[PDB]
Design a protein around this ligand. Structure first.
Ligand SMILES: [Y+3]
Ligand SMILES: [Y+3]
Lengths: 181, 25
């Protein structure tokens, strides 16, 4: 029996959904003060080994906050809420393609300047490259990568050129929380 | 299968996983 009224409203989560969440959020909460800290979330072992774990972690904290209210915890997970036919049949749900892309985009563009520099791409790359790759091959890839996606030649990737680069991508699905269903 | 598609694929993949792990199994 939480504030899951206007919450189930902003995230479009089904009753039992927020329940499995609140329950899950309850488990993540250690000292139990109705909030989470990088501390609490970093306890998720699997996430730690996740090359994006830290960026995912930080995404749960706005501008400078250091704690996540339950509604904030869900505000994020809401982006990965599976899309229902009713969602597409009204305010834009946090799980729309546009918002899923924005979320992913915000993980590349750390300085939140609106564009993905060659460096911001290079950092993401060094995170996901099994075989030891020369810092040069990377610069080359990060380069080519931004190069290919860069349309207005400003050297960086705007959200639109980002969106554009994924038009043939099944983003909806590649970003929908399976388990929840 | 452009370079982007590949990078982003792995990215969204590592992303979803982390998220699902935040939700727990
Ligand atoms: Y940037
Ligand atoms: Y650009």
């Amino acid at each position: 029996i939480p504030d899951g009224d206007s919450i189930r409203r902003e995230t479009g989560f089904s009753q039992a959904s927020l329940l499995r969440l609140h329950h899950r959020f309850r488990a993540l909460d250690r000292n139990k003060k109705g909030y989470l800290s990088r501390m609490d979330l970093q306890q998720i072992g699997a996430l730690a080994v996740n090359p994006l774990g830290d960026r995912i972690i930080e995404s749960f904290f706005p501008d400078g906050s250091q704690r996540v209210d339950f509604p904030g915890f869900v505000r994020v997970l809401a982006h990965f809420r599976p899309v229902e036919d009713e969602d597409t049949e009204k305010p834009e749900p946090l799980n729309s393609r546009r918002n899923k892309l924005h979320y992913a985009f915000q993980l590349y563009d750390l300085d939140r300047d609106g564009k993905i520099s060659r460096h911001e791409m290079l950092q993401v790359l060094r995170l996901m490259v099994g075989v030891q790759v020369t810092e040069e091959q990377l610069e080359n890839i990060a380069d080519r990568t931004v190069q290919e996606a860069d349309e207005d030649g400003d050297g960086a990737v705007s959200f639109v050129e980002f969106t554009k680069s994924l038009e043939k991508m099944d983003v909806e699905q590649k970003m929908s929380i399976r388990i929840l269903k | 299968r452009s370079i982007n598609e590949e990078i982003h694929t792995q990215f969204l993949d590592h992303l979803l996983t982390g998220i699902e792990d935040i939700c727990g199994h």
